[PDB]
Amino acid sequence: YLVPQARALCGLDESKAKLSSDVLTLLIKQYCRESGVRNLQKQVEKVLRKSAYKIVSGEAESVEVTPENLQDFVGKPVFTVERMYDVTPPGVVMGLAWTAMGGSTLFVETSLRRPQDKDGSLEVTGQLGEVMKESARIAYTFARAFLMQHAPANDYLVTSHIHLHVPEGATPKDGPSAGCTIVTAL
Amino acid sequence: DAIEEKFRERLKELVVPKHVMDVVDEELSKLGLLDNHSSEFNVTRNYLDWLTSIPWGKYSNENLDLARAQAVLEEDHYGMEDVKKRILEFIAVSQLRGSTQGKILCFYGPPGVGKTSIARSIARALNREYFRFSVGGMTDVAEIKGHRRTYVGAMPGKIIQCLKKTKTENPLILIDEVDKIGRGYQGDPSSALLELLDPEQNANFLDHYLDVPVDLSKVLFICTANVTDTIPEPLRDRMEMINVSGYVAQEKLAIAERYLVPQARALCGLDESKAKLSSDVLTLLIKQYCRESGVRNLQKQVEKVLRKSAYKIVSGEAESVEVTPENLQDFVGKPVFTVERMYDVTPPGVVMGLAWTAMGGSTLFVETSLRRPQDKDGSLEVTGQLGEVMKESARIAYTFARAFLMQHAPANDYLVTSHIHLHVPEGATPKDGPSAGCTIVTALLSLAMGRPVRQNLAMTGEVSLTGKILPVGGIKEKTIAAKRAGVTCIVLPAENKKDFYDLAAFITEGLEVHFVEHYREIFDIAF
Amino acid sequence: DAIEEKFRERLKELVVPKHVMDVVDEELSKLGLLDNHSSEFNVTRNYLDWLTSIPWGKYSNENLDLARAQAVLEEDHYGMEDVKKRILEFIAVSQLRGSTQGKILCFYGPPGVGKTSIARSIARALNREYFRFSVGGMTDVAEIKGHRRTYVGAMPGKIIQCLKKTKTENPLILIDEVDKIGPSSALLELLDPEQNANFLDHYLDVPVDLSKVLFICTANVTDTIPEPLRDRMEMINVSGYVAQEKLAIAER
Ligand SMILES: Nc1ncnc2c1ncn2[C@@H]1O[C@H](COP(=O)(O)OP(=O)(O)O)[C@@H](O)[C@H]1O
Ligand SMILES: Nc1ncnc2c1ncn2[C@@H]1O[C@H](COP(=O)(O)OP(=O)(O)O)[C@@H](O)[C@H]1O
Ligand SMILES: [Mg+2]
Ligand SMILES: [Mg+2]
């Protein structure tokens, strides 16, 4: 629907400007992650209008769009990194989050705050909301209980001072959906 | 009566659509039945006037010459490549298709960069009619939609009057300051803009006075805003966001010596033979007085110099005067931005950072000191009007610095037990953001080891709890601020390579750029 | 008719721009068919009253002479050398270009230093008309931009009121306490060289040229002034007085 109508508006035949399924897939993946259609239409129209300018100005007789030179038409990709950790060290567990620009993944990082591994504590940073901080507290309590019943000799969680961080530091996040992820990380 | 023909013979040159012609006919038939001096007669007459005044099928003689358009665009504004490219693409597309087109654009950027001014130059380039529709603080929805005929003072509204007064169906409408539209209590004008700025529904824009849809698909809508975050998302999604990035010092010099100085001389009535401003004087003025992204303050400084010279000439104090970098302070006063770098040599515990500021970016330093006299557990106090995000980043940096020193030097008990105070010496101004996490880590490690970092090294980048460096924004401003100082080496996150190399060549000529993925690389670079 | 001839006699000496003339002509034609008892007749009469009262082509005869203006400035106030220098520079620029000009200034300083009295003295020296209104605590945009003809209580706002009162297109307008404003978006359009020449009022529905008006703002602290508004105007510091200066002012 979009590309034929955009061609009819810009007046470019398929032979003069090539938009393959691969370049459209890349453009959607890297520029149009939203749930709507208007921004994808705008990107397609940008590509076609730049091809039209190249044709009219005499710079080229036909314009071919490729996944390599797409950034020449639509600039740098908005989304490039899909996951922060390729291989997760022991303290971090991968989670999932809801976002307006499609789905978004999150990680939960934990590390010792004091050298020795008298109660211990959990410091929570990462712009976590009140509900999510409460879920972190519940997760800490259940992690203590579960490690108590699974490994009685392992007093790590009760004595160690632990810092919990969700490395999307500038983006606020809330919700209890991360309780099991936090338990797994701890 | 002759009023009916006075209506009819001015539709001859208009290709009126059927849905308008059948309303005009019924209104004219109603007109001939009412008494010539009744109030209903006046209402019908006013409505027929409004319907007839619309340019139903006439367009301005748009020109499609790319060379002429580029010449017209270049004669007024310097270095607005994105907007000029967008307009040339518009012209090329409108040349491929056999008819005129319309688009909805939004120019956003820092104040004083030329968003409002470029619209008139674009309208002149396109040979389109120009209308400015400032919506700053507007809370009246009736200015967009109008009022029904039943009211005594009913008028269609601003847009229909634009079509009436421009006498063309494809003008250029400048909706100035769209982000500053008012949050009216009785109505929300931004919600009425959804119908006006809908790329598909422009063809059926319904006016409350006319009660007849008008085809606004051929109108080129240009909006100006300072920040996009204030515009409602349903309206922001309809408009095409294209950015004006502001001007670097070299671009400011080009604008001043090519546009600002000639126009200011014309305003002051002077000539180059009587008042001479050399490139060195303009460069010094930009460097020491006009750090803002716009060129309005630079324009004010230039006008100040020229008016001082004009007073010196008219009063007879001098036949002619030349401005020099030595005597410039006589005209503009003593320099404002006299210092670029707080520390020429950084002692142990302080690390040079970079920050985004409205004045073309600026550098910052992170200072750490031993609050209690010993090299229970340690604590970290933070000051400097740090925001909540920046304080959280400081806590993360402290935790990771402890962890890193746990493994790099297990015998080093400094960070574990010592009580540390961390400050950013710009205490009077608020600062926020996670960009300084790696700077804080470096400051803490330099304090712990007692070893100063490289003496001309700047760095930025968010840090995770495990030490991974995350991308940050404002690379251009941070790079410019680093290059103003004697920074010979800069450290950036690896994810910022793509938008660092998108910068102009002259900005990054002399910088030894290092791209990092984990802090263990920054540690080797700095130490 | 008598009303039309009265409005045209109001209009004889003004050099009216073409678009304003077309608007007045069409409104007069509209008034020529409405019945006298109609409420729309009242609205049209009230509208034409404002359009025929704007001084479209009248300028005050300024005293483009450095000596007399300097004498007036130094006889009316003591120690305001920065403001006096700025006004002398303004006069020199007006003389060199050979035409009247408008500027936007801002006097900021502690209260009681003479920011309003110096503005009255400047208007006296320049032979310009003087008008002032306060924006301190203002929260209504409609008192600057006006209300359209539809509403019963519509007024054309402070700027059009000033233009009608002063009968000149180059008066001295003092905007008092710009730093205490609540509304600033109307001022951004009011004082901006790019759009001063085409200031559109909602009631008038026709643009007026404010490029020759000399705007002088008053404040006490610059930091509280809105950021986009602080960029349009020029900041001149009217600082306080030392004991010797206060003694001289008191004696003189
Ligand atoms: N690139 C440029 N070249 C020449 N003059 C410029 C340029 N950018 C801005 N100006 C001048 O600076 C002023 C900026 O005002 P304006 O266009 O209103 O900026 P904004 O739209 O950001 O408010 C204009 O009067 C314009 O003449
Ligand atoms: N330098 C001066 N020379 C002469 N009179 C002065 C001077 N400074 C202040 N005054 C007097 O003090 C009064 C200040 O009132 P006003 O200017 O309205 O207060 P503000 O300065 O807070 O606006 C004026 O009436 C003026 O006559
Ligand atoms: Mg603007
Ligand atoms: Mg006062």
Count of helical segments of chain A?
A: 7
Oligomerization state of this entry?
A: part of a larger assembly
Q: Can you list the strand order of the major beta sheet of chain A? A: 3-4-6-5
Largest interface: chains, residues each: B-C, 47 and 45 residues
Number of beta-strand segments of chain A: 6
What small molecules are bound in this structure? adenosine-5'-diphosphate, magnesium ion
Structural class of chain A: alpha/beta
Can you give the helix content of chain A as a percent range?
Answer: 40-55%
**Computed Rg of chain A:** 25 Å
Report the end-to-end length of chain A measured between terminal Cα atoms.
49 Å
Shape of chain A: elongated
The SSE order of chain A reads: HEHHEHEEEHHEH
Major beta sheet of chain A, specifics?
A: 4 strands, mixed
Range of strand content of chain A: 15-25%
PDB class: hydrolase
Keywords: ATPase, protease, hydrolase
Entry title: Human Mitochondrial LONP1 Idle State bound to substrate and 6 ADP
Chains A, B, C: Lon protease homolog, mitochondrial
